[PDB]
């Protein structure tokens, strides 16, 4: 738990700035729909409850 | 001398799956309209049953670097290991893509791959990369060579899929090795090339070979 | 030596020098090792 | 455990002062995607949990 | 190598309209080295 945990941490900070994503830089966005492809959100949700 | 793909030129994207021990080989397929999913047509059988070549042939439009695949989309040629390549569908005119979509039960994190009708936008654009050492970034892709194709949004390779017992292909951080080969390259004016629909008249454009039309009685044959 | 390229074949059956396409985990396994066999088709990569 | 240490590493590289650098976090997502054991046996995709 | 890193260079400023101070500096360590390749090449063939 806690190895998937941290993977999802590392993930979530790897996330991209807000501000890039206004800026609409094609990199941010990529790897912003990359991170969620890896982690789809229904599970982040189940994990929580 | 050894040929080295280039735009301009029609290919076809084989991958090879070992079936009851026996090799097989298939080419890349999308028929575009009413379907923009890709799919694998057998190209080994040939002699005892035809292939459907037409809607498996691709041009290459553009080959370019990153960054100047950045700066366009900001705003012949050789191809080189390491570029970014638009592939378009030579019946459709649409273009290779990998789409946001994914119908596949065995991997979660893969995506389907189809035809769109724009080549704006990254989906559109795969980087080629070598299969083997033997060949290396900035050198020329060379007929025969085994290539990896990467999606430069999604940052999959085009994979083929054998988990089900249907072959399928689809977008998977996995890598599947394909190779491109050459339909044509370049024809001088007239010089009939196989592959085009053209018509067969009997004399002074009179008379034409056909069919029956349809309803006919003869079943069209 | 060094500039020739050659391809290996056995001359009574035909076929042709090449590796055995190892099978994924040989990465895990670490093996730098890969079978050689003679395949009719072979690879492009087959010369030495 | 393992896993976890070079996790935990990989997040004090990418992410300082409470901003993500992008220069560290694209090639971390890069690398862990084209090395998809990292993110463990689930999450593999095929027969994956 | 070379030649690809300077053509990637050119087009990471190609929609900035000025070089700046930094970029002009790298710009002239590639030429020089280049320079110096160019020359270096020229010698193994002159004579000829």
Same mark, same amino acid.
């Given at each position: ?49 | ?21 026996? +090799? ?18 057998? &190209? ?13 042939? !691709? ?10 695949? +950045? ?6 040629? &050789? ?35 189809? %035809? +769109?009708?724009?080549? &704006? ?34 940052? =999959? ?17 996995? +890598? ?21 629909? %053209?018509?067969? !008249? ?17 079943? =069209?044959? | ?48 | /455990? ?35 054991? /990292? ?11 | ?6 053509? $990637? ?7 900035? $309209? ?9 710009? @002239?360590?590639?030429? @020089? ?16």
């Amino acid at each position: 738990m806690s190895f998937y945990a941290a993977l999802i941490d590392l993930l979530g900070r790897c996330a991209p700035e807000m501000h890039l994503i206004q800026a609409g830089k094609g990199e941010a966005l990529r790897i912003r729909a990359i991170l969620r492809s890896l982690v789809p959100l229904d599970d982040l949700v189940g994990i929580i409850s | 001398e050894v040929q080295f793909l280039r735009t301009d030129d029609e290919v076809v994207l084989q991958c090879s799956a070992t079936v009851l021990k026996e +090799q097989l080989k298939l080419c890349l397929a999308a028929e575009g309209f009413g379907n923009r999913l890709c799919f694998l047509e057998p &190209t080994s059988n040939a002699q005892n049953v035809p292939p459907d070549l037409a809607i498996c042939c !691709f041009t290459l439009e553009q080959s370019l670097s990153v960054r100047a695949l +950045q700066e366009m989309l900001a705003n012949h040629r &050789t191809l080189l290991y390491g570029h970014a390549i638009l592939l378009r569908h030579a019946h459709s005119r649409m273009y290779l893509s990998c789409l946001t979509t994914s119908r596949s039960m065995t991997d979660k994190l893969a995506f389907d791959v189809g %035809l +769109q009708e724009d080549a &704006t936008g990254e989906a559109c654009w795969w980087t080629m990369h070598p299969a083997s050492k033997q060949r290396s970034e900035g050198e020329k892709v060379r007929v025969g060579d085994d290539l990896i194709l990467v999606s430069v949004s999604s940052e =999959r390779y085009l994979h083929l899929s054998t988990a089900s017992g249907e072959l399928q292909v689809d977008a998977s951080f996995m +890598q599947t090795l394909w190779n491109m080969n050459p339909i044509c390259s370049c024809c001088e004016e007239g010089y009939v090339t196989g592959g085009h629909v %053209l018509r067969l !008249f009997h004399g002074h454009m009179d008379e034409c070979l056909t069919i029956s039309a349809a309803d006919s009685d003869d079943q =069209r044959r | 030596y060094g500039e020739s390229l050659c391809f290996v074949q056995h001359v009574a059956s035909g076929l042709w020098l090449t590796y055995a396409a190892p099978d994924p985990k040989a990465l895990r396994l670490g093996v730098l090792k890969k079978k050689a066999i003679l395949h009719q088709e072979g690879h492009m990569d087959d010369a030495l | /455990c393992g896993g976890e240490r070079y996790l935990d590493f990989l997040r004090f590289a990418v992410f300082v002062n409470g901003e993500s650098v992008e220069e560290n976090a694209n090639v971390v997502v890069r690398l862990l995607i084209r090395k998809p054991e /990292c993110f463990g046996p689930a999450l593999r995709g095929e027969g994956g949990s | 190598r070379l030649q690809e890193s300077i053509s $990637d260079f050119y087009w990471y400023y190609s929609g900035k $309209d000025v070089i700046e101070e930094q970029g002009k500096r790298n710009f @002239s360590k590639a030429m @020089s080295v280049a320079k110096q390749v160019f020359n270096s090449l020229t010698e193994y063939i002159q004579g000829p």
